[PDB]
């Protein structure tokens, strides 16, 4: 199936909230991050589709990045998400 369908089928809330709490918060968070990796892993090709999954997390939280600065910060956290889940950062992935 397409990455379009694979990513939309998943619940990215734990991933988006995990990132938001760190950037906007400059235990529950290991279970929230653990649930994040569980949701990514449910994708049939989770290593492929990782770019789309990160782009969808960013698209989902964009309205809440009220600042020129918050957007850099969200991006670094996002970019570190794949390694946190024992995947590799994707290769042609523009998060802007």
């Amino acid at each position: 199936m397409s990455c379009e369908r694979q990513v939309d089928r998943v619940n990215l809330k734990p991933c988006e909230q995990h990132i938001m709490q760190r950037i906007m918060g400059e235990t529950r968070s290991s279970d929230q991050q653990q649930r994040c990796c569980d949701e990514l892993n449910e994708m049939e090709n989770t290593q492929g589709c990782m770019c789309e999954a990160l782009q969808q997390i960013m698209e989902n939280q964009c309205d809440r990045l009220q600042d020129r600065q918050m957007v850099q910060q969200f991006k670094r956290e996002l970019m570190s998400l794949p390694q946190q889940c024992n995947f590799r950062a994707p290769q042609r992935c523009d998060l802007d």
Epitope: M79, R88, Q91, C93
Partner: antibody, heavy 121, light 106 residues
Framework: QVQLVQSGPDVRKPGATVKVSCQTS????????MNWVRQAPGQGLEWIGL????????AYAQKFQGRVTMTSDTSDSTVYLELSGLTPDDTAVYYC??????????????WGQGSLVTVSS | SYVLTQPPSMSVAPGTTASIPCGAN??????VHWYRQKPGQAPVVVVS???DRIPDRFSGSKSGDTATLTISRVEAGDEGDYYC???????????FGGGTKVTVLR
Amino acid sequence: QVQLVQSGPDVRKPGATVKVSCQTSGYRFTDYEMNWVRQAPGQGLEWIGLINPHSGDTAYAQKFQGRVTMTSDTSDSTVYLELSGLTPDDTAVYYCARSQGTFEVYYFVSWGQGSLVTVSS
Amino acid sequence: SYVLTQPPSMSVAPGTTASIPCGANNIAKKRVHWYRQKPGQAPVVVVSDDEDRIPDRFSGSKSGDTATLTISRVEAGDEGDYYCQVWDSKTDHVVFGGGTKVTVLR
């Protein structure tokens, strides 16, 4: 260490197909995309497209959309370029290149020795 | 198609600094990489615009519509063809500049 060994030089008649192969070694195949770039004698570098060995996904440059196929083989860490409907504009040395970088960073860190394919009757 | 434009040739006095420009619309907002190629050899990356990849004599910069490769204390071994390279996320194409033949004075 990182090593890219391409197939020998080839000559093909106009309108025929050429298949170029590139065997990689010394790194974890499926961790990096492989690209094909050509150079007509005395000309610039021209990107053809790429394949991801982890998914078999490809992206081809517009010029070759419909005449090029790339495939990847995990049993021997080898990728393939296949170009059909050849004309003399296609004579060039063909390089495989190993990509490097993530996200918005995408360059070439290793290359094969090149394969000169001449299209001539 | 996204086009990178380079001067075709360039002569540089030995021991001086070389600046090779690579022109394209809004190029400074992309990552720009540079290759050197010698006769009969595959290209070799000399500037990698990577944060993962000790300083050397090769340096790249960008502003507005121009990317520039700088070569310090230019040497005879720096002769060759230099290519700039990007990845355009809008088209998902790798793009090379035309190339600049750097000949070193003597």
